[PDB]
Design a protein around this nucleic acid. Structure first.
Ligand SMILES: [Mg+2]
Ligand SMILES: [Zn+2]
Lengths: 413, 216, 58, 54, 246, 651, 201
RNA sequence: UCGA
């Protein structure tokens, strides 16, 4: 037995249920979940968790961040009356200010729930994942945000209050535009997902595992599903419950992975740490007569072992896709720790351009070392083509000032 | 040890009797054992008496009216449901009521037999206005707790038999000894005394632990 | 302990749709053999086919 | 489209375009051998999956 | 009771003629609608071992139809288990569930061996289980294994094993979030932010060295091992021991 | 109204009119507005009633701006709406202002206190659940009411109002007699327990006494769901936001036993039954008492006319009207001819068609009005005597009933605990409802916490606050109103435990079973809960074997006609994804659409030996004959050795 | 109208007895107030015997090690804490001590083999009789922490007897081994009965 | 029309 010496969340409870299935089966796993809910029902009544008004702790830095955000709006409205910015440049400054202000309020809520009191009734329901969510907490103690029109146009007037301070009559009809849009989109979602599930059944109703083996040699190459910069599905999550078609020989010809070997949960972590492209058996490459082979399909994901002869895999495949159908709705920042005068140089042809905001920025279309002045710390920075710089040759920046913004369409009127 | 005393004994206008008791001394953690066990018996196990059935002598069901009375049969049965009565015979009794005149009907106009008394007078029943007459009669039966009603023109009422309304107790420390001091508040409806309800509640708990120490 | 006896029967059989037919075909033999006046209300013929099949499995 | 171009005319007429499948099946003289699901439900027999496989 | 007497009506009538109370169906149907207390004793002996399939519309996945073993309860509603609530996607604000009763002997063996709720822990879509604490039992387990830095009441005490701390929780010795050293000789101790380094190495006499850690205290030459934890985490770890080891 | 609309299929197509909205003679909706002249709201004359012409011409401010006492407007930046866009301009440039903050919402949304603190999705549900609350036996006015309940009670038409400004003379339970002054005795009739359309009561109770001056517009007699003056749809009882032992897990309600024996949430439902003595061509039907095969066990409440009396307690399975029907079959089987020849007792020519009480129905009969011919009323053709029976019953609150509040916190009661098991306050008062606090922060139901904490302040004071929605100073009108009035209730010398300095909206609650206090303080308060029409009695349905369809020979569907549950196409796909092939064949053959398979399956359970292999279902043979009538030669064959013959599925 | 019997009993390898009782018939609501009042008396108000003070030669404080013994002196304070014995309400005496060799002692010792030492040792301890617990703060005999707990675990469940409804109390008592679970129920019932007899008056 |  092992000793869990940490605080138990919802996601740490699902790892305990999945560990009891792999070792003991289904009868002892259901008894573990039957005893874990006697423990949860007993110590929730003994705790006495309750919601109150003052449990919704509004952070005291909200007033200091709302009057600082309105100063950036007041210095933009006065620039609009001088003809220095357009209507699109004024609209891009107002929306990016209030959306950026709500991100500082959302991060201040999580910090204030850990320094003031770790055992808070709103924080316990959201951090443990019982019923709350951070999109629902920020509407209770933070800012509501920027709502949109019934057609989709974001209104420039924000809702600075929340459900604890109370909305106004003007802020209630703006919030009703999204409540009606979210209500009529739910009823049309069930009619589109219901017809999609029916079409997936009739196209795969006669897909029954009839034979044991077919004797094919084709395979399907699977890799890590990376959506550009960040990864979504790892290699260990795709090899789970699928047989092998080729040997994996990474270190010195390692024979730990052979052909037609059932990959377990811990075995998929060993293949993903050696190679990146694994050839597995798939029903796309299956050569069978009006059926899918038993080795080409893989494991039963609800039983933990291989599939049996004579069971419809197409009905389970059509039901697994149509079930979540009703619940389906590039540049970095730069900084400088030293204040001084930048050195442009003749090596970069920094041309003048205009950004999406109402400010001028010299656009650099080539490389170059944007070196700023310093006493002992020579702060240097590299350029990038297509981005823009802000500092001019001869200007003394302040402490921690933004030097530039390096980079790591649709038509509208 | 175990000195029982009464701190105060308040009494409302013939409708409630509040008394404050005290227990000193006790053990290190027996302030909750004596306190909570005496509260659960006083609120659910004390027997009482109330009006079970009413024959109004002229209306067969409950969803009709009487010509001349301000209230119908249903509002009369709700006023007699909260009537405070007591008895000693352990038998269903019969009490009558007549009313002629334009005045209101109170609990003092009843005709109860021997060993059955009305504790609270001036209980509001339906009023008469100068042109009618009420000849209803009621049945007084004893019971424990709350009974479910699931003869000749009798209307059954789901009466209650709880003479004690609310019991409150706090545990206080005395001044090395970890002993406690328990005070108790008993609120009755006048049908029984709080000193008599404490003696009856202590009889049930003492008899619940008689055959657990002799046979074992 | 009936649910613990059913998980041992479904395991080490290689076909969960075939060993449940042998339980249903043995429960009809236990029902025809229990046609006398003695009828146990706790031990149904469908439950007795699972206990007798797990004892002969070992 | 793949649901209507199958070998069974009963499984295609119950899904969509009943007047178009039965018109094509009568002229071509198609034959359903009751293979697979969604036919034995209409016929009234055991499905070939599950415990009705063998 | 009034719904089970209608669903299991041919099974009650067969038991009445077999026991010798009635002789036909007309004598049995008049005895059922009369309301005798002997009829409910027959209905108690019939439903034992008879699976009943429960069903909630709409049926999105295949775990929306599961079989159960019914019991006669008091009231007029179906007492559903709270653990199968994410499976049926059922909420207690007006949901109605359809009840179905099998008849043949082959249908009873398929509802028990293939359609029972205890054998449906894992979902058919992914490999992740759905029978799990969801809303009210996660909050009971988060508060149990939490850390309250104000209500200690006897923190920093050494106890002799797991059973010594359970006997000290029934008394008024320790609280739920007290820092408690527990003598535990096992090495498989998982925790948040684990470490293998040894800080504050203290050496005793006769060559014995004490290996101090962030949460452990191992007496090296392993002789003893003390674990700093809360008594709420000992009650949680004791529940997994009596459920997985039988 | 942007909030009140039904959810589901008709989401947005069926709207509701607002509070101050008015339709002119042309058919356009108008809204009143106050004139603003040079930054000063001219609240002296009548409004303008603009007919939606303020879009491209006028600048309209809502009713939320802070104004002064006839001087000016306090705010410097007034948010307005101009050409369907929101903007903040100068207060000297505006033209019109709204007359009320409840002008946007309807008359049902305005009954929700603290509407600005609740979400718009839960305020949609709170307005729909308020229109489903049953009238209780003794209603009670809310303590956190909005003040608009008095106007909605007089405009409903079920409240007797005075018109003469006179002196009340005689008051009883049936009429109220006053005399007009500056044929002088008018009689106001009072209905007593009349049946409604949704099986509820329409009882009216007298309010005034003899010898009292009245005014035109004064309540003389309130309705069933109406208290004195204002409307009353529920009760004010104690609430606590604490999880019990799994009894309030997922939107479930835990109530106490005190709500049962105090007649709280007890409504009266009056059902109506119907029978008719029609004209059968074999012989005329008449209502008699001597019906065959029914002894003295059901002929106790008849007055030798076949009809029941008034005030008889009927239960499930009784006989309300005994009616016979003549038959002319004369097709007796040889088994029944031998059984009748032994013991005699030759069968009559009549058949018992008596009106009976359905399953799970009981009550007291209150109206046995019979409408026959030659009495002054018209009858439908083919009918001799029309009997109408009205049965009233008193339903208490039970396990399985659906209760809700004014903020969309609906739920179903799962357990009724005694008063010694419920938690209790430190004065000894127990807790009625133990609600779950987990559903509060996930749905943004903040106004229900403001309502219970303010109603608890009105409980200890007895003042019955009236708070209008949509304020005043920000953060000084909702938090410091509740916490400021809770401090005034704690200043009494007898009530010092009501308010705490550390935790303001919380007190210490003790456990009822063990007597030990809980570890954390719990928010208590006086919540206003309603009782909806979705009771547990109307959802019970079961069927062993009943009627069948006309063509497909399948079981019917319906609670009132003993129907069966439908096993649709999504339910077949779950069993097809399972291994349940024998359960799927059983549900489609021996339980539906088989005139032969249903007989052998029912005979197998009574005898005790089940048989396999059911026959061909009836619904396939109907489709086979329908495709042959379309000009398609469709048939079934056999692929056996040297034999290709068509099979006869019908014959 | 009251009967009480034991359903089943069990005893492990160590002397730790266990029994399950049944109380029938109890009134509606009386099953909870009986099982909860018996739980607080059996766990807290029960006299027991334990080791409160030891004395080992050559040891000065609770952190110093003694030559010859593998474990520390804190382990001797923990192994002597779970010593199951009964003093029969006597005056505090002096006990002596000369594999584990737990079978020897200088009072009837119940299960005399749990753990003493694994040396390759002269101890002098005392035995006191009382109720409750005591925590010794640092700063002759070395007083250790002692817990007088003759009953370790009490579990009770209340279910309905029949359908006025009745209740049925199922009481589970996990004793230490010094006293019987049937005997401990008779002692705990004597304490509750002595608190309501002068209260009856 | 109304519930999920
Ligand atoms: Mg639901
Ligand atoms: Zn293959």
């Amino acid at each position: 037995m092992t000793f869990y010496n940490y605080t138990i969340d919802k996601g740490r409870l699902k790892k305990l249920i999945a560990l009891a299935y792999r070792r003991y089966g289904s009868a002892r796993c259901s008894q573990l979940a039957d005893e874990l809910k006697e423990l949860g029902f007993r110590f929730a009544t003994k705790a006495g968790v309750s919601i109150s008004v003052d449990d919704l702790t509004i952070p005291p830095e909200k007033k200091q961040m709302l009057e600082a955000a309105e100063k950036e709006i007041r210095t933009t409205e006065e620039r609009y009356a001088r003809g220095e910015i357009t209507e699109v440049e004024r609209f891009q400054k107002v929306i990016d200010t209030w959306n950026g202000t709500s991100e500082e309020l959302k991060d201040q809520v999580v910090v204030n729930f850990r320094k003031t009191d770790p055992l808070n009734s709103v924080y316990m329901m959201a951090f443990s994942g019982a019923r709350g969510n951070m999109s629902q907490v920020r509407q209770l103690v933070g800012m509501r945000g920027l709502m949109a029109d019934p057609q989709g146009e974001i209104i420039d007037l924000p809702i600075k209050t929340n459900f604890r301070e109370g909305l106004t009559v003007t802020e209630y009809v703006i919030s009703s535009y999204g409540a009606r849009k979210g209500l009529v989109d739910t009823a049309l979602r069930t009619a589109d997902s219901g017809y999609l599930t029916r079409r997936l059944v009739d196209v795969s109703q006669d897909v029954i595992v009839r034979e044991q083996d077919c004797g094919t040699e084709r395979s399907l190459r699977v890799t890590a599903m990376t959506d550009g910069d960040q990864v979504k599905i790892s290699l260990a999550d795709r090899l789970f419950g699928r047989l092998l078609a080729k040997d994996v020989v990474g270190p010195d010809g390692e024979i730990i992975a052979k052909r037609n070997d059932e990959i377990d949960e811990a075995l998929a972590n060993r293949i993903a740490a050696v190679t990146d492209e694994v050839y597995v058996r798939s029903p796309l490459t299956c050569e069978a007569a009006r059926s899918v082979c038993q080795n080409c399909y893989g494991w039963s994901l609800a039983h933990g072992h291989k599939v049996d002869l004579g069971e419809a895999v197409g009905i389970i495949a059509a039901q697994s896709i149509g079930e979540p159908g009703t619940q389906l709705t590039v540049a970095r920042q730069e900084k400088a720790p030293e204040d001084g005068t930048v050195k442009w140089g003749k090596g970069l042809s920094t041309r003048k351009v205009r950004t999406r905001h109402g400010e001028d920025a010299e656009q650099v279309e080539i490389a170059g070392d944007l070196i700023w002045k310093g006493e002992g710390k020579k702060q240097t920075y590299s350029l990038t083509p297509g981005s823009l710089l802000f500092v001019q040759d001869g200007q003394t920046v302040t402490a921690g000032q933004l030097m530039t913004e390096i980079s790591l369409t649709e038509r509208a009127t | 040890q175990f000195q029982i005393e009464c701190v105060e004994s308040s009494t409302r206008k013939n409708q409630q009797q509040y008394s404050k008791f005290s227990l000193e001394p006790l053990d290190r953690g027996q302030g909750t054992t004596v306190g909570n066990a005496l509260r659960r018996v006083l609120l659910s196990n004390l027997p009482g008496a109330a009006v079970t059935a009413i024959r109004i002598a002229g209306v067969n069901h409950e969803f009709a009216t009487i010509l001349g009375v301000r209230e119908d049969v249903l509002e009369i049965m709700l006023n007699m449901k909260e009537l405070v009565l007591k008895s000693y015979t352990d038998q269903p009794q019969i009490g009558r009521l007549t009313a002629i005149g334009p005045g209101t009907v109170t609990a003092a106009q009843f005709e109860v037999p021997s060993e059955v008394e009305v504790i609270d007078p001036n209980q509001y029943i339906a009023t008469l206005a100068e042109g009618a007459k009420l000849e209803m009669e009621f049945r007084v039966e004893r019971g424990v707790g709350y009974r479910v009603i699931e003869s000749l023109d009798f209307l059954q009422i789901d009466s209650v038999f709880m003479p004690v309304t609310k019991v409150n107790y706090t545990v206080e420390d005395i001044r090395m000894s970890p002993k406690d001091r328990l005070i108790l508040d008993i609120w009755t409806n006048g049908s029984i005394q709080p000193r008599e309800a404490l003696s009856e509640a202590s009889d049930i708990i003492a008899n619940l632990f008689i055959p657990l120490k002799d046979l074992n | 302990h009936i649910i613990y006896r059913s998980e041992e029967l479904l395991g080490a059989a290689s076909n969960r749709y075939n060993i449940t037919v042998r339980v249903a075909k043995r429960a009809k033999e236990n029902r025809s053999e229990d046609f006398d006046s003695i009828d146990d209300p706790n031990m149904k013929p469908a439950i007795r086919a699972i206990i007798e099949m797990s004892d002969e499995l070992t | 489209k793949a649901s209507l171009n199958t070998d069974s005319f009963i499984s295609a007429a119950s899904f969509q375009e009943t007047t178009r499948v039965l018109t094509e099946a009568a002229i071509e003289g198609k034959s359903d051998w009751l293979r697979g699901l969604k036919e034995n439900v209409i016929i009234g027999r055991l499905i070939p999956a599950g415990t009705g496989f063998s | 009771r009034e719904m089970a007497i209608e669903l299991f009506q041919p099974f009650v009538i067969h038991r009445l003629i077999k026991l010798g109370i009635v002789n036909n169906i007309k004598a049995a149907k008049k005895l059922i609608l009369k309301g005798d207390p002997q009829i409910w004793s027959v209905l108690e002996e019939v439903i034992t071992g008879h699976p009943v399939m429960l069903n909630r519309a709409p049926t999105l996945h295949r775990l929306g139809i599961q079989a159960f073993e019914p019991i006669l309860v008091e009231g007029r509603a179906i007492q559903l288990h709270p653990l199968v609530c994410p499976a049926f996607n059922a909420d207690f604000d007006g949901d109605q569930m359809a009840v179905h009763v099998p008849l043949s002997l082959e249908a009873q063996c398929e509802a028990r061996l293939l359609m029972l709720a205890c054998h449906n822990v894992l979902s058919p879509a992914t490999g992740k289980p759905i029978v799990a604490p969801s809303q009210d039992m996660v909050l009971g387990c988060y508060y149990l294994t939490a850390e309250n830095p104000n209500a200690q009441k006897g923190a920093g005490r050494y106890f002799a094993g797991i059973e010594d701390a359970l006997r000290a929780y029934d008394h008024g010795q320790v609280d739920l979030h007290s820092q408690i050293w527990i003598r535990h000789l096992d090495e498989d101790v998982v925790t948040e932010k684990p470490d293998t380094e040894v800080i504050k190495t203290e050496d005793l006499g006769d060559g014995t060295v004490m290996k101090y850690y962030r949460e452990r205290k191992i007496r090296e030459g392993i002789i003893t091992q003390y674990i700093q934890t809360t008594p709420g985490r000992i009650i949680y770890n004791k529940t997994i021991a009596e459920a997985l080891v039988f | 109204c942007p909030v009140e609309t039904p959810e589901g299929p008709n989401a947005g197509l069926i709207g509701s009119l607002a509070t101050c909205a008015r339709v002119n003679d042309y058919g356009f909706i108008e809204t009143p507005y106050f004139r603003v002249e040079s930054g000063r709201v001219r609240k002296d004359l009548d409004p303008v009633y603009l007919t939606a012409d303020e879009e491209d011409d006028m600048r309209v401010a809502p009713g939320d701006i802070p104004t002064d006492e006839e001087g000016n407007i306090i705010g410097e930046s007034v948010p307005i709406r101009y050409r369907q866009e929101f903007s903040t301009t100068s207060p000297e440039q505006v033209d019109y202002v709204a007359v009320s903050p409840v002008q946007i919402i309807s008359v049902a949304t305005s009954m929700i206190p603290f509407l600005e603190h609740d979400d718009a999705n839960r305020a949609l549900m709170g307005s729909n659940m308020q229109r489903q609350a049953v009238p209780l036996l003794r209603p009670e006015r809310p303590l956190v009411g909005t003040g608009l309940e008095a106007q909605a009670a007089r405009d409903s038409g079920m409240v007797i109002v005075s018109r003469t400004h006179g002196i009340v003379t005689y008051v009883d339970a049936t009429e109220i007699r006053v005399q007009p002054h500056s044929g002088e005795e008018i009689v106001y009739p009072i209905q007593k327990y009349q049946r409604s359309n949704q099986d509820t009561c329409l009882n009216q109770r007298p309010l005034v006494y003899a010898g009292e001056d009245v005014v035109p517009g004064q309540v003389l007699a309130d309705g069933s769901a109406t208290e004195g003056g204002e409307l009353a749809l529920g009760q004010n009882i104690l609430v606590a936001y604490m999880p019990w032992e799994g009894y309030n897990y997922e939107d479930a309600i835990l109530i106490s036993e005190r709500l049962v024996y105090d007649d709280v949430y007890t409504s009266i439902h009056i059902e109506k039954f119907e029978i008719e003595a029609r004209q059968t061509k074999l012989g005329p039907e008449e209502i008699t008492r001597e019906i065959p095969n029914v002894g003295e066990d059901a002929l106790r409440n008849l007055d030798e006319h076949g009809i029941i009396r008034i005030g008889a307690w009927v239960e499930s399975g009784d006989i309300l009207v005994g009616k016979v029907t003549p038959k002319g079959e004369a097709d007796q089987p040889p088994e029944e001819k031998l059984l009748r020849a032994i013991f005699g007792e030759k069968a009559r020519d009549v058949r018992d068609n008596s009106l009976r009480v359905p399953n799970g129905e009981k009550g007291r009969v209150v109206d046995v009005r019979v409408f026959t011919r030659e009495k002054g009323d018209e009858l439908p053709p083919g009918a001799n005597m029309v009997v109408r029976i009205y049965v009233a019953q008193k339903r208490k609150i039970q396990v399985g009933d659906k209760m809700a509040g004014r903020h969309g916190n609906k739920g179903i009661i799962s357990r009724i605990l005694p008063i010694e098991d419920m938690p209790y306050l430190p004065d000894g008062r127990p807790i009625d409802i133990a609600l779950n606090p987990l559903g509060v922060p996930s749905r943004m139901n903040v106004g229900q916490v403001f309502e219970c904490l303010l109603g608890w302040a009105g409980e200890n004071l007895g003042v019955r606050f009236k708070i209008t929605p949509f304020d005043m100073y920000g953060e000084e009108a909702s938090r410091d109103t509740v916490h400021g009035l809770l401090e005034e209730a704690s200043q009494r010398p007898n009530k010092d435990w009501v308010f705490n300095e550390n935790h303001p909206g919380k007190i210490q609650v003790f456990d009822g079973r063990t007597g030990e206090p809980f570890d954390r303080p719990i928010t208590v308060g006086q919540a206003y809960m309603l009782k909806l029409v979705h009771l547990v009695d109307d959802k019970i349905h079961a069927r062993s074997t009943g009627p069948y369809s006309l063509v497909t020979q399948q079981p019917l569907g319906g609670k009132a006609q003993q129907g069966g549950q439908r096993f649709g196409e999504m339910e077949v796909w779950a069993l097809e994804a399972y291994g349940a092939a024998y359960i799927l064949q059983e549900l489609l053959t021996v339980k539906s659409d088989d005139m032969q398979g249903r007989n052998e399956a029912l005979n197998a359970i009574v005898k005790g030996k089940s048989i396999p292999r059911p026959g061909t279902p009836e619904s396939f043979k109907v489709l086979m004959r329908e495709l042959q009538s379309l000009g398609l030669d469709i048939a079934a064959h056999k692929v056996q050795l040297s034999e290709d013959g068509e099979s006869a599925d019908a014959e």
